[PDB]
Amino acid sequence: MNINPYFLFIDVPIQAAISTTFPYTGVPPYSHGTGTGYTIDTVIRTHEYSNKGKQYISDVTGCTMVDPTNGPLPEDNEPSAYAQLDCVLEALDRMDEEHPGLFQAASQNAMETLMVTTVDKLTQGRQTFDWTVCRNQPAATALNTTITSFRLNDLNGADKGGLIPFCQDIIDSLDRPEMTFFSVKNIKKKLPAKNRKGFLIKRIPMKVKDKITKVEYIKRALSLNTMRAIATAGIQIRGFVLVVENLAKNICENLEQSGLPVGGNEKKAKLSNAVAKMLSNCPPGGISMTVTGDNTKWNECLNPRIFLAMTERITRDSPIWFRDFCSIAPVLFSNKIARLGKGFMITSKTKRLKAQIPCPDLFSIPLERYNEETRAKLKKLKPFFNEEGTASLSPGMMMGMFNMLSTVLGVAALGIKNIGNKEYLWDGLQSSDDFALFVNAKDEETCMEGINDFYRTCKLLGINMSKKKSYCNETGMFEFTSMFYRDGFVSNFAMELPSFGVAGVNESADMAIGMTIIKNNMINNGMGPATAQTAIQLFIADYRYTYKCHRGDSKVEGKRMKIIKELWENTKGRDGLLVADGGPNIYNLRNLHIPEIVLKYNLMDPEYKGRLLHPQNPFVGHDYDAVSGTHSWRTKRNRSILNTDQRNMILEEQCYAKCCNLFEACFNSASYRKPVGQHSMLEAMAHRLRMDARLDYESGRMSKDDFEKAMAHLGEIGYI
Amino acid sequence: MTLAKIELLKQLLRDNEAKTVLKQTTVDQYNIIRKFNTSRIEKNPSLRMKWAMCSNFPLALTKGDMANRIPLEYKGIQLKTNAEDIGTKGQMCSIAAVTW
Amino acid sequence: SAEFIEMLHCLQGENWRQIYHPGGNKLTESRSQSMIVACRKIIRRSIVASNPLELAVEIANKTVIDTEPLKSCL
Amino acid sequence: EEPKIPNKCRVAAWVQTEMNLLSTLTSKRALDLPEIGPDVAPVEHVGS
Amino acid sequence: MEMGRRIHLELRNRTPSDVKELVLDNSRSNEGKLEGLTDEFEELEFLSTINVGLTSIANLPKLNKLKKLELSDNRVSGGLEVLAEKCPNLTHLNLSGNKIKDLSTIEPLKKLENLKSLDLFNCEVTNLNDYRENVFKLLPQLTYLDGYDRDDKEA
Amino acid sequence: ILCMVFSQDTRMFQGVRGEINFLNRAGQLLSPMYQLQRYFLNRSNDLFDQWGYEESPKASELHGINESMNASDYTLKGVVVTRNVIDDFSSTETEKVSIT
Amino acid sequence: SGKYDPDLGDFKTIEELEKLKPGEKANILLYQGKPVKVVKRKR
Questions:
Q1: Upstream peptide bond of A261 is cis (omega within 30 degrees of 0)
Q2: Pick from A86, A340, A388, B12: most CB atoms within 10 A?
Q3: Residue from A265, A484, A520 whose CB has the most chain C CBs within 10 Å, to mutate
């Protein structure tokens, strides 16, 4: 009997059968390498779909620029980035007329939020491209480095605290003839280390001051570095994109078509409501069709100039300063420069050699030495390449940075609802990459005529529908963002599942975080009761393994398990003991939002309650919900190097190695005989030698003459 | 030999730099250089705590009468340490201590 | 409802709905609030078993609300 | 150096045997998960 | 070496009805047969045929006393129903290393009722889901198999 | 360690701290030389501590080694490590040898 | 019938106990450190 798993589809609808095909909503490790080649291909494709536009030379950054907007309309079904401004303006006009007082209110709310916001908001983000060092650093570190450089350059926006002064100082820094900043430089090492020679070589960083001309800083600020996001943007762009996205979110929240920022069962409600609404107003005897459309090269076709036009149209009645503030982001994106990453690698098999060619030296060697695909890619990329290992890139959107504005543009495309006053009405939903289109007509022929008209219209707006990944069927069954809807039933394609291990804070905190994660997964991603209970079981298993807190009545052995077993033997209320103390777990679906301390309080032993919740215990000392007890301990978090200046100047003197060598013998002869606790190493040596001489004389290793000589020298030391 | 170490220490003290570094730098500071010399930071918090718990004294401890109330040893099991720590500026306690 | 969102994880799902009602300091009809549920369980135990009459009367005669038989409370 | 694109291969008969055998019931089990609190709500009973 | 040489060595040039067992191993056969064993045989208990290149079972004396037979490392693939008409008194069957395609090949053993142990190792039929259960309900007379019916005993 | 024991240096004798009553797998009492060999090999850090230290071999290549065997200066009294190649054991005559 | 006899061998699993024949002696383990020696019986 040869199994055939696909045969399940015979007895089960495919929508349910393929539920949760991918356990991971993130990124796999085996995805096609996103290196210099991938970014080169991305820029090549971005410039390829817009090569019929206007090509010119930027007078600021001196880089090639391509502008496809208002360019010739496509004559082929291939992707096109030529979005006419008039069509976009008309679509925005239609949206505004349909929703009176929407753009004004959204712009007002966005500007008020910007006025009340603070620079600290910029720290909530993923890896950010720091320009001072030209790398990827955490948001907080990047913001701190930018602030320090601004202070060095007589720019103190962060001092005022507001975000508006910070962005004003950013755009002012874009005007300084020379920009001075701090940078980190690594220098080799010569300090001792015991492997076989008491000598090792490493890298130590130091802070230095570096200055850059105006054009260099201008190019650096617009740079987009690469680490399914393809690149990250520095700090000079973060505030403006934040404001523009807040505006777009304010607009979208009141757009019934927008599929964002819906999350949870609200998504299912929106899907079913849209289907029901479209079916209700279907013409008597007409036909309703549904397209699960997808967009190819979504972010490689949208143009920053079109986003600038959308921002200008939306904020047509708003203070001029806010209009400029909103416009600062699209103009920055329209001049974005991509960084190609590390570079390539070329090898010689005959001599068994290999080397890494960095981006600036990409063209330093004949193209014949690159494989076919890289040769062609470099040949095509030559015009859009800079001498500093960067590529000019005017068009494109390099994945998600204006997702809300993309959704707004898609909703505008969906809001036309008719072309030529034909016998079809279209509508649907769209969330920043994917759209579901519902069209009502008389016969399927007119429905497909309407679908064709919608395809042409979105082409006019620069949105390219995917013919190779889209299909149409009678309304009632479709998909929308990995969520299959079928005549009321709803299923998910990919659902994130709890990862192995505890959260990584502490016993009570880890338990609370795990339970709240399970609860959130149930609420949002739609995890069934049995799956949630199994997740609880797995989390308990992992927690017990990590904290070595198996059941008190178990037969396992461990350093902590002996005390756990003794406590279990001495305790009467064994149902009230916490899991961390080998007690029984009692968590279930109905009580996934209650801390275990509160759950078990009524069953705890009063003596155990006092010991556990002692107001002054030595462990606690000085989101999720838990109880502050003896299980809220803190782990030692102290590493790296402090006292950097003193340590560096000491290590750079000379005699440190001799001190280490003298220390090593005596204080390694025994595993631990160090009077540690801030004792000066000289004092510890004096005490150690005094004790060694005492022991030598007592055992007879030394005569009285050597004894007295040693004490004489020890007397001369100063600690005797 | 005690005398050999003594004479070597005197010879080293003849030089000013060695005398200064020995007078100022403490035994606690001696460990720090070795750490960065052959140690650095890690990631993956879930596994980080897994490694930390298996160690002897991963838990920070407060200073006070209650901290000293718990013993150093218990049925052949260590609980805390006497010598002061650098980072926390206080004692460090083993996981079992909490259970105690 | 403030008291309904907190439990939402156990109330509503993608394709199921749990009928749940809140509570809070509804004390006074203690004895009654007890007997009913106890009685309910008896029926739940008797309907499944064959010939529910004798089993139901047996369980009802041998049940005590913490001091007294269910018959007195009823 | 040129990229070693994956080769092209025909149907492998051992994958069918893998699927057939891995779906059989053996004489041993290797799963021991911890316990959960008592079930009260009907949804908990269904999940259990 | 040939089947005849093995027959002569085992019988030592005596009457056919003098040995209740045979060892036909490492013997070349004409087109994959078991020649050299005449139908005159009347008493036989154990059999052993390994590396004989037997491709089919069509030549075998009619018998009523054999209880064990051993076939291995052969490319035989065909119906075994003929065993019922030739010797429906088999108790130990060994097909380890043989070449059988699907379950249908082992069907004709249903009509035999005295079989208690059947061996099928590294057989193309052995790599299937519920092959153990499917064979069991297909041959109810079977009391043993590759060795793990319910316990472990030795032949 | 072995050259130390063989040399019969008075410091090696004065560095003993335990006891010498060991035997072999056959259960025989050995001569004091081999008993000391086994004692010192079992406890290497016995004569090393009290042997005494000597300044490093200040020179182009001659460099010292500490008690921990790391290529660290402040070497043992007498011991020297040269960054050259020592080639020895010439004239392998295989001279006549008797067997008791 | 007796006590731990390393000579007879290590502890025997239930699989070997079930296939054992009458009159044959085996070794079993109750818990850690308390082995015992048993013998099959017809009754």
A1: yes
A2: A340
A3: A265
